[PDB]
Amino acid sequence: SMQNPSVTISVNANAGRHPINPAVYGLAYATTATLADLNVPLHRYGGNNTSRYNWQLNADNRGADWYFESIGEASSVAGERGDTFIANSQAAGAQAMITIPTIGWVARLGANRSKLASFSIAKYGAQSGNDWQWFPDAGNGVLTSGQNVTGNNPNDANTLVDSTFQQGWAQHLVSQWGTAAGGGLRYYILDNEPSIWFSTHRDVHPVGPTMDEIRDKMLDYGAKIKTVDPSALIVGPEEWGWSGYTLSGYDQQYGGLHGWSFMPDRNNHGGWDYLPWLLDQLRQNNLSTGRRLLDVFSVHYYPQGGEFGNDTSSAMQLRRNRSTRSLWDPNYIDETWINDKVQLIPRLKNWVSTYYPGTLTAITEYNWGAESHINGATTQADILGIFGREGLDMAARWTTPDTATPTYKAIKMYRNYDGNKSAFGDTSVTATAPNPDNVSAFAAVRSSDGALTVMVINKYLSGNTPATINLSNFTAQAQAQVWQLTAANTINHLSNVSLSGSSLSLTLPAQSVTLLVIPAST
Numbered sequence: 001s002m003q004n005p006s007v008t009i010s011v012n013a014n015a016g017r018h019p020i021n022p023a024v025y026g027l028a029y030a031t032t033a034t035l036a037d038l039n040v041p042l043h044r045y046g047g048n049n050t051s052r053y054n055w056q057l058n059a060d061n062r063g064a065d066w067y068f069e070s071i072g073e074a075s076s077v078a079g080e081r082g083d084t085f086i087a088n089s090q091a092a093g094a095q096a097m098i099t100i101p102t103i104g105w106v107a108r109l110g111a112n113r114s115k116l117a118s119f120s121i122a123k124y125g126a127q128s129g130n131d132w133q134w135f136p137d138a139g140n141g142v143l144t145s146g147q148n149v150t151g152n153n154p155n156d157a158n159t160l161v162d163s164t165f166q167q168g169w170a171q172h173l174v175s176q177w178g179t180a181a182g183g184g185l186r187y188y189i190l191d192n193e194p195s196i197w198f199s200t201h202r203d204v205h206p207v208g209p210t211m212d213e214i215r216d217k218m219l220d221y222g223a224k225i226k227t228v229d230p231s232a233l234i235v236g237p238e239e240w241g242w243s244g245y246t247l248s249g250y251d252q253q254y255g256g257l258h259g260w261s262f263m264p265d266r267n268n269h270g271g272w273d274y275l276p277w278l279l280d281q282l283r284q285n286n287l288s289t290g291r292r293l294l295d296v297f298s299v300h301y302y303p304q305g306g307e308f309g310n311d312t313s314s315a316m317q318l319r320r321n322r323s324t325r326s327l328w329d330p331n332y333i334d335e336t337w338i339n340d341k342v343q344l345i346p347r348l349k350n351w352v353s354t355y356y357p358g359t360l361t362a363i364t365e366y367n368w369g370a371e372s373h374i375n376g377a378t379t380q381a382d383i384l385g386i387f388g389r390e391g392l393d394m395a396a397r398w399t400t401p402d403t404a405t406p407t408y409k410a411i412k413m414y415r416n417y418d419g420n421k422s423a424f425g426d427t428s429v430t431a432t433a434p435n436p437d438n439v440s441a442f443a444a445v446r447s448s449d450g451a452l453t454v455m456v457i458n459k460y461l462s463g464n465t466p467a468t469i470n471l472s473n474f475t476a477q478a479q480a481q482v483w484q485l486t487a488a489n490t491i492n493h494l495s496n497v498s499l500s501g502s503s504l505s506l507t508l509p510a511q512s513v514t515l516l517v518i519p520a521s522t
């Protein structure tokens with residue numbers, strides 16, 4: 001009975017045509033089983049601890065996430081974490097992405113691959129937290145006064161390595177797997193969120209890196225890896241979010257300790273914003289040596305309004321319906337401390353085109369929260385539509401939703417909606433909806449099929465929504481197939497719906513993701 005205002009959506013198979021790269025469907029920390037079942041072709045190995053991974057010991061340091069403990073993997077075979085990750089990805093037809101540390105300071109181990117700790121309680125004294133279950137001497141590096149322990153010796157739990165040390169890892173990967181061109185590892189990620197090393201890796205990097213240090217690191221590590229494999233693709237810098245797009249880690253830190261009135265690094269570099277200057281330095285280097293070191297320009301982005309978590313109150317559901325505007329919308333002011341028009345994807349494409357053309361664009365971490373709730377799933381389906389429409393070259397969600405959740409099934413609406421790996425189309429085309437906070441829509445034409453696939457997301461918290469879809473420039477059969485996800489948490493194959501001219505009409509349940517598969521003539 002309950003009913004929302006009617007909506008009309010116009011899909012025109014001739015407007016705004018461009019490929020959708022299947023790499024937008026990427027994921028982090030999935031399994032061979034879920035990579036195959038979600039039909040996902042990109043698998044990222046990345047995140048905080050990967051900055052500290054010692055490929056020669058097969059070990060890493062957890063940083064601030066786990067008491068700055070250096071911890072060995074079970075195996076002591078050089079590089080096994082990476083090899084295992086690659087085998088498991090390729091077992092499912094997915095391309096792996098491996099993070100190579102750039103930070104220099106990576107884990108070492110004590111006698112018998114025993115754990116080490118950067119903030120030993122016996123060495124630096126009483127602190128306010130410690131690993132009391134598994135390693136009691138490992139402090140959190142904060143004194144009981146709440147003031148950080150400072151002056152710790154970086155060798156307590158780590159060893160300082162350089163680009164020749166990580167080049168050795170690239171040589172190993174190439175020997176096991178072949179080059180990228182020959183079916184080997186295609187993507188090298190350079191580190192992870194380097195601007196905030198001063199916080200995630202305070203033990204070993206207490207001062208935020210300048211934009212110089214980070215440029216030098218991409219130049220250095222990038223050259224080494226490309227010597228070993230000129231066919232592989234380098235991805236970076238993996239910056240953490242809004243402030244990391246315009247301010248180096250040195251300036252972020254400086255600002256947190258001294259207020260925002262004077263940014264020393266920014267000032268030393270004529271008022272440039274960080275990532276645009278980084279892109280521009282890489283351009284100048286590429287123009288001068290003739291060699292491309294960075295191929296994919298990558299950032300992380302998480303909404304700032306409290307949506308990353310499990311708050312599923314009404315007000316938070318409505319905010320998730322709106323806040324994905326930050327990924328595309330030039331007029332949307334973000335409703336948070338950011339308080340500015342982020343329009344991330346156009347921004348990424350604009351920066352690349354202004355400062356380093358021909359570089360691809362990636363969001364290699366995002367998450368909009370509420371994974372186990374229909375609102376998380378409408379939101380995820382909303383995000384995947386936006387990636388394709390807006391022309392992002394790659395993406396990796398952080399991380400992979402549990403197979404029981406409706407969010408898992410949202411990804412599967414795009415990639416394996418019938419259990420036979422049929423997927424949304426791969427040439428984006430215009431679909432226009434009047435208000436995407438209430439209902440958003442995305443279309444594409446499928447190359448294998450000529451089918452027009454149209455995804456409609458009803459974001460409204462209650463009531464059915466009558467919906468009419470108008471096709472231009474597409475000659476369609478009599479009937480369109482219907483597949484649907486609601487809070488019932490199952491992909492349903494509903495009844496075919498009859499086309500009325502080049503229109504079709506239907507009733508959309510509240511908080512639902514609906515897929516129309518509309519085959520071409522004849």
Ligand SMILES: OC[C@H]1O[C@@H](O)[C@H](O)[C@@H](O)[C@@H]1O
Binds near residue numbers: 048193240300
């Ligand atoms: O917010 C979740 C994640 O984002 C980033 O800060 C890091 O890459 C991850 O290791 C972290 O846990």
Ligand SMILES: [Zn+2]
Binds near residue numbers: 103205209213
């Ligand atoms: Zn450094």
Ligand SMILES: [Zn+2]
Binds near residue numbers: 212269
């Ligand atoms: Zn400089």
Ligand SMILES: [Zn+2]
Binds near residue numbers: 257258
């Ligand atoms: Zn100071």
